[PDB]
Design an enzyme around this catalytic site. Structure first.
Site, PDB file in Angstrom:
ATOM      1  N   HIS A 192       0.825  -1.202   0.000  1.00  0.00           N
ATOM      2  CA  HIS A 192       0.000   0.000   0.000  1.00  0.00           C
ATOM      3  C   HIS A 192       0.867   1.263   0.000  1.00  0.00           C
ATOM      4  CE1 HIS A 192       0.316  -0.035   4.472  1.00  0.00           C
ATOM      5  NE2 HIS A 192       0.208   1.290   4.342  1.00  0.00           N
ATOM      6  N   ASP A 237      -0.089  -7.619   1.724  1.00  0.00           N
ATOM      7  CA  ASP A 237       0.412  -6.255   1.716  1.00  0.00           C
ATOM      8  C   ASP A 237       1.939  -6.237   1.840  1.00  0.00           C
ATOM      9  OD1 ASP A 237       0.438  -3.509   1.626  1.00  0.00           O
ATOM     10  OD2 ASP A 237      -0.390  -3.251   3.664  1.00  0.00           O
ATOM     11  N   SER A 280       3.628   2.710   8.012  1.00  0.00           N
ATOM     12  CA  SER A 280       3.377   1.782   6.925  1.00  0.00           C
ATOM     13  C   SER A 280       4.683   1.232   6.378  1.00  0.00           C
ATOM     14  CB  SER A 280       2.677   2.521   5.788  1.00  0.00           C
ATOM     15  OG  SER A 280       1.373   2.946   6.136  1.00  0.00           O
ATOM     16  N   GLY A 281       4.732  -0.090   6.202  1.00  0.00           N
ATOM     17  CA  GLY A 281       5.896  -0.721   5.601  1.00  0.00           C
ATOM     18  C   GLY A 281       7.026  -1.059   6.551  1.00  0.00           C
TER      19      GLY A 281
HETATM   20  C1  LIG Z   1      -3.643   3.140   0.353  1.00  0.00           C
HETATM   21  O1  LIG Z   1      -4.053   2.779   1.683  1.00  0.00           O
HETATM   22  C2  LIG Z   1      -3.342   3.360   2.662  1.00  0.00           C
HETATM   23  O2  LIG Z   1      -2.465   4.192   2.474  1.00  0.00           O
HETATM   24  C3  LIG Z   1      -3.778   2.864   3.959  1.00  0.00           C
HETATM   25  C4  LIG Z   1      -3.064   3.203   5.170  1.00  0.00           C
HETATM   26  C5  LIG Z   1      -1.908   4.112   5.204  1.00  0.00           C
HETATM   27  N1  LIG Z   1      -3.530   2.735   6.380  1.00  0.00           N
HETATM   28  C6  LIG Z   1      -2.751   2.856   7.576  1.00  0.00           C
HETATM   29  C7  LIG Z   1      -3.068   3.805   8.535  1.00  0.00           C
HETATM   30  C8  LIG Z   1      -2.327   3.940   9.691  1.00  0.00           C
HETATM   31  C9  LIG Z   1      -1.231   3.096   9.905  1.00  0.00           C
HETATM   32  C10 LIG Z   1      -0.910   2.132   8.949  1.00  0.00           C
HETATM   33  C11 LIG Z   1       0.185   1.154   9.244  1.00  0.00           C
HETATM   34  F1  LIG Z   1      -0.246   0.203  10.093  1.00  0.00           F
HETATM   35  F2  LIG Z   1       0.618   0.507   8.155  1.00  0.00           F
HETATM   36  F3  LIG Z   1       1.244   1.732   9.827  1.00  0.00           F
HETATM   37  C12 LIG Z   1      -1.648   2.006   7.788  1.00  0.00           C
HETATM   38  C13 LIG Z   1      -4.770   2.118   6.491  1.00  0.00           C
HETATM   39  N2  LIG Z   1      -5.403   1.802   7.577  1.00  0.00           N
HETATM   40  N3  LIG Z   1      -6.601   1.319   7.118  1.00  0.00           N
HETATM   41  C14 LIG Z   1      -6.667   1.349   5.776  1.00  0.00           C
HETATM   42  O3  LIG Z   1      -7.608   1.019   5.033  1.00  0.00           O
HETATM   43  N4  LIG Z   1      -5.473   1.862   5.331  1.00  0.00           N
HETATM   44  C15 LIG Z   1      -4.887   1.988   4.112  1.00  0.00           C
HETATM   45  C16 LIG Z   1      -4.634   0.592   3.532  1.00  0.00           C
HETATM   46  C17 LIG Z   1      -3.621  -0.112   4.279  1.00  0.00           C
HETATM   47  C18 LIG Z   1      -3.260  -1.398   3.947  1.00  0.00           C
HETATM   48  C19 LIG Z   1      -3.877  -2.037   2.885  1.00  0.00           C
HETATM   49  C20 LIG Z   1      -3.580  -3.412   2.601  1.00  0.00           C
HETATM   50  N5  LIG Z   1      -3.399  -4.532   2.423  1.00  0.00           N
HETATM   51  C21 LIG Z   1      -4.842  -1.360   2.139  1.00  0.00           C
HETATM   52  C22 LIG Z   1      -5.237  -0.044   2.462  1.00  0.00           C
HETATM   53  C23 LIG Z   1      -6.348   0.511   1.605  1.00  0.00           C
HETATM   54  C24 LIG Z   1      -7.654  -0.141   2.016  1.00  0.00           C
HETATM   55  N6  LIG Z   1      -8.866   0.477   1.368  1.00  0.00           N
HETATM   56  C25 LIG Z   1      -9.101   1.846   1.920  1.00  0.00           C
HETATM   57  C26 LIG Z   1      -8.762   0.490  -0.117  1.00  0.00           C
HETATM   58  C27 LIG Z   1     -10.025  -0.354   1.817  1.00  0.00           C
END
Ligand code: A1JN2
Ligand SMILES: *[C@@H]1O[C@H](CO[C@@H]2O[C@@H](C)[C@@H](O)[C@@H](O)[C@@H]2O)[C@@H](O)[C@H](O)[C@H]1NC(C)=O
Ligand code: NAG
Ligand code: NAG
Ligand code: NAG
Ligand code: FUC
Length: 218
Positions: A41, A88, A173-174
């Site tokens: 992501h 992911d 993230s990551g």
């Molecule tokens: C592009 O997405 C993102 O940047 C998403 C992010 C950055 N975070 C997120 C928020 C806080 C801390 C962290 C950390 F844990 F990685 F640090 C991550 C997130 N939290 N919830 C969430 O949906 N997301 C995002 C997301 C994260 C992981 C995946 C996977 N596999 C998919 C999505 C997108 C999901 N949809 C919105 C399409 C349903």
């Protein structure tokens, strides 16, 4: 990282900052001299030609002569599913090979299939948001967390801090989750906002992907 602490400088020499023009946007882990692994992501909607892979960092606000900076030559994916938040994981092949030294080291990974039990103690880390509307960390943060299976899917490793609100946040993230000396997670998603004190943080389960990782790094 919300509610964590500053890492000792260069305590985690496999820790990577992925950067774009003026700064950090995601963590990663050095898994071979010429490969890092991160969350899919992180890079799904970014021009990888612009990504700088920064090894050997501690305080992102300083010029640090310990840093080594690479570009991304190639990406390898493994079925990233953003709708279901699955698989992911991404491997970024670098445009050269790191110089391995005290400040830049390859991480150790678990065996394929190894699950972590409820109650395993891990360290999360990263340069993400500090909470209390404090923005991105300058100094690498770490945080003690505990593995939980409640409110988690079998397709993730999840963690929770008990007795207070603390956890990973945007920009973490990551980043790696280190459990018993091995990289068992890649920070993937939070629920309930960061540091809810309700929902565990979710990590991509590195052990589920080890044969795939190994096949790439050779
Ligand atoms: C592009 O997405 C993102 O940047 C998403 C992010 C950055 N975070 C997120 C928020 C806080 C801390 C962290 C950390 F844990 F990685 F640090 C991550 C997130 N939290 N919830 C969430 O949906 N997301 C995002 C997301 C994260 C992981 C995946 C996977 N596999 C998919 C999505 C997108 C999901 N949809 C919105 C399409 C349903
Ligand atoms: C907090 O975490 C400290 C570091 O954790 C240990 O080392 C890291 C790298 C991982 O391998 C992790 O699994 C290990 O537990 C511990 O030294 C310390 O005891 C922890 N404290 C509490 C109360 O959890
Ligand atoms: C961030 C970084 O390392 N960028 C370098 C740059 O400083 C150098 O001038 C160029 C040519 O070697 O290669 C690239
Ligand atoms: C890498 C690290 O700091 N690990 C420490 C370990 O040395 C210590 O024995 C344990 C119990 O307190 O806590 C943790
Ligand atoms: C790789 O990219 C970095 C960052 O742009 C650059 O400094 C370095 O010279 C490149 N290395 C090779 C071997 O091309
Ligand atoms: C990501 C890379 O970073 C450095 C530059 O020398 C390259 O041109 C590229 O921008």
């Amino acid at each position: 990282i919300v509610g964590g602490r500053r890492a000792r400088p260069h305590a985690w020499p496999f820790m990577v900052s992925l950067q774009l023009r003026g700064g950090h946007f995601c963590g990663a882990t050095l898994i071979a001299p010429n490969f890092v692994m991160s969350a899919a992501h992180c890079v799904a909607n970014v021009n990888v030609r612009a990504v700088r892979v920064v090894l050997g960092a501690h305080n992102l606000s300083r010029r640090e002569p310990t840093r080594q900076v690479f570009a991304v030559q190639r990406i390898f994916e493994n079925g990233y599913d953003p709708v279901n938040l699955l698989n992911d994981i991404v491997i970024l092949q670098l445009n050269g090979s790191a110089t391995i030294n005290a400040n830049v080291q390859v991480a150790q990974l678990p065996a394929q299939g190894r699950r972590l039990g409820n109650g395993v103690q891990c360290l999360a880390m990263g340069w993400g948001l500090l909470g209390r509307n404090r923005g991105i960390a300058s100094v690498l943060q770490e945080l003690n967390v505990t593995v939980v299976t409640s409110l988690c899917r079998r397709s993730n490793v999840c963690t929770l801090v008990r007795g207070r609100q603390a956890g990973v946040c945007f920009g973490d993230s990551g980043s790696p989750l280190v459990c018993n000396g091995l990289i068992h997670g890649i920070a993937s998603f939070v629920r309930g906002g960061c540091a809810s004190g309700l929902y565990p943080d979710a990590f991509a389960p590195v052990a589920q992907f080890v044969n795939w990782i190994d096949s790439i790094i050779q």
